Each structure stands twice: as structure tokens, then as C-alpha cells.
Enzyme design. Structure first.
Site, PDB file in Angstrom:
ATOM      1  N   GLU A  38      -5.481   7.634   8.135  1.00  0.00           N
ATOM      2  CA  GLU A  38      -5.086   8.618   7.113  1.00  0.00           C
ATOM      3  C   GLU A  38      -3.583   8.859   7.149  1.00  0.00           C
ATOM      4  O   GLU A  38      -3.048   9.436   8.098  1.00  0.00           O
ATOM      5  CB  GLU A  38      -5.832   9.957   7.228  1.00  0.00           C
ATOM      6  CG  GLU A  38      -7.294   9.872   6.951  1.00  0.00           C
ATOM      7  CD  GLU A  38      -7.606   9.418   5.520  1.00  0.00           C
ATOM      8  OE1 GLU A  38      -6.696   9.404   4.672  1.00  0.00           O
ATOM      9  OE2 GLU A  38      -8.778   9.085   5.251  1.00  0.00           O
ATOM     10  N   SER A  39      -2.908   8.433   6.087  1.00  0.00           N
ATOM     11  CA  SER A  39      -1.449   8.441   6.019  1.00  0.00           C
ATOM     12  C   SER A  39      -0.826   9.784   6.368  1.00  0.00           C
ATOM     13  O   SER A  39       0.181   9.841   7.080  1.00  0.00           O
ATOM     14  CB  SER A  39      -1.020   8.028   4.612  1.00  0.00           C
ATOM     15  OG  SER A  39      -1.512   8.919   3.604  1.00  0.00           O
ATOM     16  N   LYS A  69      -9.906  -8.973   7.211  1.00  0.00           N
ATOM     17  CA  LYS A  69      -9.530  -8.058   8.274  1.00  0.00           C
ATOM     18  C   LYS A  69      -9.918  -8.622   9.638  1.00  0.00           C
ATOM     19  O   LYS A  69     -10.992  -9.199   9.808  1.00  0.00           O
ATOM     20  CB  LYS A  69     -10.191  -6.699   8.053  1.00  0.00           C
ATOM     21  CG  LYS A  69      -9.927  -6.160   6.646  1.00  0.00           C
ATOM     22  CD  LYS A  69     -10.457  -4.785   6.446  1.00  0.00           C
ATOM     23  CE  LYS A  69      -9.988  -4.222   5.089  1.00  0.00           C
ATOM     24  NZ  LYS A  69     -10.854  -3.050   4.728  1.00  0.00           N
ATOM     25  N   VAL A  82      -5.880   0.939   5.783  1.00  0.00           N
ATOM     26  CA  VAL A  82      -4.508   1.110   6.191  1.00  0.00           C
ATOM     27  C   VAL A  82      -3.889   2.269   5.430  1.00  0.00           C
ATOM     28  O   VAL A  82      -4.264   2.537   4.275  1.00  0.00           O
ATOM     29  CB  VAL A  82      -3.669  -0.181   5.984  1.00  0.00           C
ATOM     30  CG1 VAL A  82      -4.205  -1.275   6.862  1.00  0.00           C
ATOM     31  CG2 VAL A  82      -3.673  -0.619   4.488  1.00  0.00           C
ATOM     32  N   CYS A 142       0.831  -1.204   0.000  1.00  0.00           N
ATOM     33  CA  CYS A 142       0.000   0.000   0.000  1.00  0.00           C
ATOM     34  C   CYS A 142       0.865   1.254   0.000  1.00  0.00           C
ATOM     35  O   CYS A 142       1.679   1.422   0.902  1.00  0.00           O
ATOM     36  CB  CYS A 142      -0.929   0.022   1.192  1.00  0.00           C
ATOM     37  SG  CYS A 142      -1.985   1.502   1.233  1.00  0.00           S
TER      38      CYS A 142
HETATM   39  N1  GSH Z   1      -6.665   8.406   2.108  1.00  0.00           N
HETATM   40  C1  GSH Z   1      -6.114   7.199   2.694  1.00  0.00           C
HETATM   41  C2  GSH Z   1      -5.968   6.105   1.643  1.00  0.00           C
HETATM   42  C3  GSH Z   1      -5.695   4.761   2.318  1.00  0.00           C
HETATM   43  C4  GSH Z   1      -6.202   3.584   1.441  1.00  0.00           C
HETATM   44  O1  GSH Z   1      -7.016   3.722   0.570  1.00  0.00           O
HETATM   45  N2  GSH Z   1      -5.661   2.255   1.685  1.00  0.00           N
HETATM   46  C5  GSH Z   1      -6.106   1.087   0.958  1.00  0.00           C
HETATM   47  C6  GSH Z   1      -4.961   0.142   0.672  1.00  0.00           C
HETATM   48  S1  GSH Z   1      -3.664   0.901  -0.359  1.00  0.00           S
HETATM   49  C7  GSH Z   1      -7.073   0.354   1.895  1.00  0.00           C
HETATM   50  O2  GSH Z   1      -6.775   0.107   3.037  1.00  0.00           O
HETATM   51  N3  GSH Z   1      -8.334  -0.058   1.357  1.00  0.00           N
HETATM   52  C8  GSH Z   1      -9.335  -0.779   2.112  1.00  0.00           C
HETATM   53  C9  GSH Z   1      -9.461  -2.230   1.599  1.00  0.00           C
HETATM   54  O3  GSH Z   1      -8.795  -2.674   0.623  1.00  0.00           O
HETATM   55  O4  GSH Z   1     -10.270  -2.997   2.168  1.00  0.00           O
HETATM   56  C10 GSH Z   1      -4.749   7.488   3.292  1.00  0.00           C
HETATM   57  O5  GSH Z   1      -4.070   8.474   2.919  1.00  0.00           O
HETATM   58  O6  GSH Z   1      -4.302   6.697   4.166  1.00  0.00           O
END
Ligand code: GSH
Ligand code: GSH
Lengths: 233, 221
Positions: free
Chosen positions: A79-80, A54, A67, A27
Site C-alpha cells: 500500500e503506497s 510475478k 506494487v 505504476c
Molecule cells: N491501493 C494500492 C494500489 C496499488 C495497485 O493497484 N498497483 C497495481 C499496478 S499500478 C498492481 O500492482 N496491480 C496488480 C497486477 O497488475 O497484477 C496502493 O496504493 O498501493
């Protein structure tokens, strides 16, 4: 699971800690927050989250299920970019200070982090998902435009100059993934200008960045990731 | 083309030169976010009205993107309302209150919910104004209420964090001041969003710093 040098880093962060990082090795948003921890020497436990299965504690403390996320002293955040700023606030003596200590420079960092998040990363996605060669060329041109808006301001080697910052960290994961564009969407770093060539090289050779990098995934895997994101839209 | 009402008094009170210059537009809810923070924290500032139809060369010189709010401080310039709000916290560290709090975790919490205001609530409000067709308007209004309840589910009262006024409140307040547009033109009414929204909007729009920045109302044009 993580591979390459990232696998070493994961194995070195199995022990419990006050700060728990809920991560996915694949990710790029996680990589941002992971790079910050590696830059600052903050102790952390790495937990790999399988998005297709999860675990219940993760969902209890982080119901939106994304994540990266952290648990720290019993509270949870995601949120990263928020996590990157939280590490700055919560471990104030763990240098480098990746926003700088200077109020204006901190604002300037936040401004250009926003450009990465709003312009560059979304266009990366739209270029991967573009189907027709014409639409691919239009999104690639827009990718170059957004890269060049940023490299116009890069002092060198990093955004602020010698001082690594959150602008570099926000973007570095997508430099590591731009081979996807080179191999499938007609992209070359050189076509965005020499400043991008040099800055990309600086970001991908940063030691903290290398320590979070796994073996390169295939186009099918990232495309699958983007379709899952669409399905969650 | 200039502030009116209470806001005109606040403008009149900030014509003297100061280290911090705020480039503003009286009508702009984004400017209001940043203006409210200055009034909360008692930071000296000079207010300059930017007419969007005749932008001064100097404003364009130091702020090419030409948006308001912007500031000039110690020869450097910056824009984006929420960045400016965070800049005021960092640049004036002894001017209380600390509108993101001083606790690292709570600061992150405030940032998270400022984002929900910034990325969900305000955009939906704006899609609802621009929508013309019952189709998109019925959808955006439903969406708008959904975002409000999600937020009031976390409002402790009187303000988001409880007694402590914060940037979550500030990020949203200008659109509470403007929701008469929705009420008069898009079927909106605070009471449909729940008693908690009714009380929280009241708390935001009676906040002294908010009142200080409030001009007379505009029409759907
Ligand atoms: N805006 C969020 C984006 C985080 C995101 O979209 N992560 C993806 C993986 S790269 C995730 O966990 N998606 C939920 C899933 O696949 O169930 C950030 O900056 O952390
Ligand atoms: N994202 C910006 C939005 C600022 C914005 O859109 N400002 C409008 C006034 S409400 C503006 O300056 N538009 C340029 C113009 O009309 O000349 C912020 O948060 O400050």
C-alpha cells in the site's frame, strides 16, 4: 522497463540494500513511494515486477501481489500510502519529514491525502473509462470539482506552502499523467482554475518527481492497465 | 438524543472545559472509535453532544463539513475518526498506551489492518443493514463473514496483536457492539464466523474503554 530519467534512477539502485522496493515503472502508486525515498535519500534496491510474470519470492512475501511493496529486515508491506508513512517512521533522521513534525499539520496532511485517494484519483480513472461524450463531460466536471476542493487549500507553491509534503506526493503521479485527459477527454488544466495551473506546474517540476518519471505511455497502455484492474476487481 | 447507560456517566464526567474538546454523537460508531482512544490514553477532554438536527453555529463555523467526531484543540479543528485517533497518538506522546505501537513496521501492520476494517468490514456491515432484498442481503452477509474470517485469521488473541490493545481493535469495536442489529434482522450470528470471531468479539466488547462509551441499544430504526 523504466525509461528517461527514471531509467537512470533504476540503474543507480541495483545494489542490494536493507530496504527492497518492489516496483513497476508504469505504476502511479509505486511513484508515490518512490518519490518519498528519493526525497529522503533513503537507501533502497529497486526491483522491477512484471505483473504478467510475478516471481515466486515476491508472491511469498506479498501474496496480494500489488506494487509497490517492500521487504525490510525480513518483513514485507504494501500500500503506497502506508509505505510512505513507514518511511517516515523507520528512517526518522532522513529529512524532510513529509508529514511535518507538527501533530495538527500531520493530521491535516493525512486528511488531504485522503481527499486525493478518495475523490481525485478514482474520478481520474472513471473519466478515462467513460465512453459516451456526455458521461465523459460529467466525469470531467467531477474531476474539476475534486481538484478545486484541493486547490482551494493549496498555500503555494505546494499544498502546505514552501514545505513539500505527502499531499503533494500522493497527487503528483496523476499530474504527470493528465496529458491522457487533455488528449482524449477534453481536459485542460486552465479549466480547473489558475491555482490548479500553478500547483500542477509545481508538482511536475519537483526534482524527486522528475527522477521517477519515464517516457509518456500511450492511451492504449493505460486503458489496458485499467481493464486489467477491472479484471482483478 | 443523549447518551445513556455507562456512556452517560462518562459524558457527565467530562463536562468541565479542557484544552481538547470532542464534538460527539452518542449513537455514532465513528465517534466511539475516537472516544475509546481518549479513554485508553487518559487524555483530558471535554465532551460536547452535537444534535444532528440542530447544529450549533460554532461547531459549523470550525467544522463546516459538520461530521462527528470532531475536535477543537489549541484553536485548530480536525475530523475523521481514524485521523483523530492518530492525532491523539501524535499530540499526546507521553499518554500511553501507544495504540499503533512504537515499532515502525508494526505501526504499518496496524495501519494495514485498520484499513481492512475501515474499507472492507465496516462497509459490508453497512451494506447488509441497508439491503432489503434476500438477493443483496444474502450476498452481503456472506461477504461479511468472509471479511471476519480473513481478520480473525490474523487475530493473535485476546486482541488483534495479541496482548497489546491497538487501533485495529478500536476501529472495529463499535460494530461489534452493534452486531445485535445483524443478529436480530439479517440472519447473522457470531458462531457462524468461527470460534475465533466469538472470542475476539467478546474481548472487544468487554474492554473497559469500550464499555465506558456504550449507550443503551438502538432499534433497527
Ligand atoms: N491501493 C494500492 C494500489 C496499488 C495497485 O493497484 N498497483 C497495481 C499496478 S499500478 C498492481 O500492482 N496491480 C496488480 C497486477 O497488475 O497484477 C496502493 O496504493 O498501493
Ligand atoms: N468518515 C467519517 C464518518 C463520520 C460520520 O459519518 N458521522 C456521522 C454520525 S455516525 C455524521 O456526523 N453525519 C452528519 C449528520 O448526520 O449530521 C469518520 O470516520 O469520522
Amino acid at each position: 522497463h523504466a525509461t528517461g530519467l527514471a531509467a537512470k534512477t533504476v540503474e543507480q539502485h541495483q545494489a542490494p540494500q536493507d530496504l527492497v522496493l518492489y516496483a513497476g515503472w508504469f505504476c502511479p502508486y509505486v511513484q508515490r513511494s518512490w518519490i518519498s525515498l528519493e526525497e529522503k535519500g533513503i537507501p533502497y534496491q529497486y526491483k522491477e515486477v512484471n505483473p504478467y510474470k510475478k516471481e515466486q519470492h515476491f508472491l511469498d512475501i506479498n501474496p496480494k501481489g500489488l506494487v509497490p511493496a517492500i521487504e525490510y529486515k525480513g518483513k514485507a508491506m504494501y500500500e503506497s500510502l502506508i509505505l510512505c508513512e513507514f518511511f517516515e517512521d523507520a528512517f526518522p533522521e532522513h529529512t524532510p519529514h513529509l508529514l511535518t513534525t507538527d501533530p495538527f499539520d500531520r493530521a491535516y496532511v493525512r486528511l488531504w491525502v485522503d481527499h486525493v485517494s478518495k475523490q481525485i484519483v478514482p474520478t481520474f480513472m472513471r473519466l478515462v473509462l467513460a465512453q459516451e461524450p456526455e458521461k465523459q463531460q460529467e466525469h470531467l466536471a467531477d474531476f474539476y470539482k475534486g481538484l478545486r476542493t484541493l486547490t482551494d487549500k493549496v498555500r503555494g507553491p505546494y499544498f502546505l506552502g514552501a514545505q513539500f509534503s505527502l499531499v503533494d506526493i500522493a497527487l503528483a503521479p496523476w499530474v504527470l499523467r493528465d496529458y491522457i485527459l487533455a488528449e482524449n477527454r477534453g481536459y485542460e488544466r486552465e479549466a480547473a482554475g489558475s491555482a490548479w495551473v500553478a500547483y500542477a506546474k509545481a508538482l511536475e517540476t519537483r526534482e524527486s518527481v522528475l527522477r521517477t518519471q519515464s517516457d509518456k505511455e500511450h492511451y492504449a497502455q493505460i486503458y489496458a492497465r485499467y481493464l486489467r484492474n477491472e479484471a482483478q476487481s
